Amino acid sequence: HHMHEIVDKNGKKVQKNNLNDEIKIIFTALDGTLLNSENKVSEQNLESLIRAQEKGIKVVIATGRSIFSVENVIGEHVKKNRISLLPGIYMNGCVTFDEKGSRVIDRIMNNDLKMEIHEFSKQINISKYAIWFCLEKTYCFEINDCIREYMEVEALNPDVIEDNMLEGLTVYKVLFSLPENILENTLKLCREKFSHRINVANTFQSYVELFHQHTNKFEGVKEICKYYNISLNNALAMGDGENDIEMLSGLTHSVGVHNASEKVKNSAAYVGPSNNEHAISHVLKTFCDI
Ligand SMILES: O=P(O)(O)OC[C@H]1O[C@H](O)[C@@H](O)[C@@H](O)[C@@H]1O
Ligand SMILES: [Mg+2]
């Protein structure tokens, strides 16, 4: 079967003996890539991560999430030191930590732009779907089934605040948890209004994230590789969503998971197993020989 294979653009399996780069470090998206559809690390993936640690391969989370929600989803693994959150790439790069928890990237949204996005969101009536991200906390203006759905998957609940409190907050990103029915049009409206102003990414399902326009996960990847004196050619990125495209196309070695959109797969060097098929386990086997 094709379930566990990794192949190049021509559909040929990638072979270890044809690789000329040692892979020292793996950057992975969490939801949709490392985590299966139940938001869990599969046992096969876990087993391979244990081997990766034994061999000194670094595995770095690269996510739109804050480090706080990541710890809420995978905390049992973090507590056992099976997955390290420091260094890590959070909020799509806008908060990137080194191993001491220092921010090697801190990209705060300009406050005028924040308020312009806020007012625009109230004008097109998606403000009720907004989750605003400060460094340590998240905020929303109400709770509805879309906010509920975000809370369930995110596993970290925003505080409910009044509209007028946003002005005083210092924010990195906003995430809109949208109804499916308005996603496509809302995405168009945000991209037309905010081009050359902010990044606009449809990250998972109906979620739309806006974050500093010059930052993305690959910027985080470069800083963490720099930290460890690792050439980009010794790094591999794996991902599923729009917010992974820069890191997949920026690294010579990159793997889109089978469940990714064609657009995301196009940006990646190789296509691997789906997130439900233990993708990092097979990446580790192919690139690192386990
Ligand atoms: O960046 P990652 O780790 O792939 O996860 C991204 C996803 O995280 C969670 O599932 C949600 O917040 C989604 O809105 C988001 O798209
Ligand atoms: Mg993802």
Segment 94-102 long-range contacts (CB within 8 Å, at least 24 positions apart): 94/172, 94/173, 94/211, 94/212, 94/215, 95/66, 95/67, 95/135, 95/172, 96/219, 96/220, 96/223, 96/224, 97/67, 98/223, 98/224, 98/227, 99/227
- Candidate of 65, 157, 264 to mutate for ligand 1, largest count of ligand atoms within 8 Å of Cβ: 65
Residue nearest to atom 15 of ligand 1 (CA): 204
DSSP structural state of residue 242: G
Residue 112 CA, ligand 1 centroid: distance in Å: 26
Residue 54 CA, ligand 1 centroid: distance in Å: 28
* CATH architecture type of domain 1-107+215-290: 3-Layer(aba) Sandwich (3.40)
**Is 133 in contact with 150 (CB distance < 8 Å)?**
no
* Residue 190 CB partners (closer than 8 Å, separation 6+): 120, 200, 208, 210
**Is 237 in contact with 247 (CB distance < 8 Å)?**
yes
**Is 28 in contact with 280 (CB distance < 8 Å)?**
yes
CA distance 262 to 269: 13
| Fold equal for 1-107+215-290 and 108-214 | no
From first CA to last CA, the distance across the chain in angstroms is: 20
Under DSSP, is residue 61 helix (H, G, I), strand (E, B) or coil? Answer: strand
Determination approach = X-ray
**Is 40 in contact with 277 (CB distance < 8 Å)?**
no
CA distance 33 to 203: 12
* CATH architecture type of domain 108-214: 2-Layer Sandwich (3.30)
Residue nearest to atom 13 of ligand 1 (CA): 204
Give the number of whichever ligand sits closest to the CA of residue 176: 1
Residue 64 CA, ligand 1 centroid: distance in Å: 6
- Identify the CA nearest to 62 among candidates 37, 88, 81, 101: 88
Q: Which residue has the tokens 């210092």?
A: 170
199's enclosing H/E stretch is strand 198-202
* Residue 123 CB partners (closer than 8 Å, separation 6+): none
Is-cis flag, bond preceding 158, omega within 30?
no
Residue 245 CA, ligand 2 centroid: distance in Å: 11
* Residue 270 CB partners (closer than 8 Å, separation 6+): 6, 7, 8, 9, 14, 253, 254, 255, 256
Task: Indicate the resolution in Å.
Answer: 1.8
As residues whose CB is below 5 A from the ion ligand 2, the structure lists 29, 31-32, 240-241
CA distance 116 to 74: 35
Q: Where are the domains of the chain?
A: 1-107+215-290, 108-214
Q: Which atom of ligand 1 is least distant from the CA of 175?
A: 14
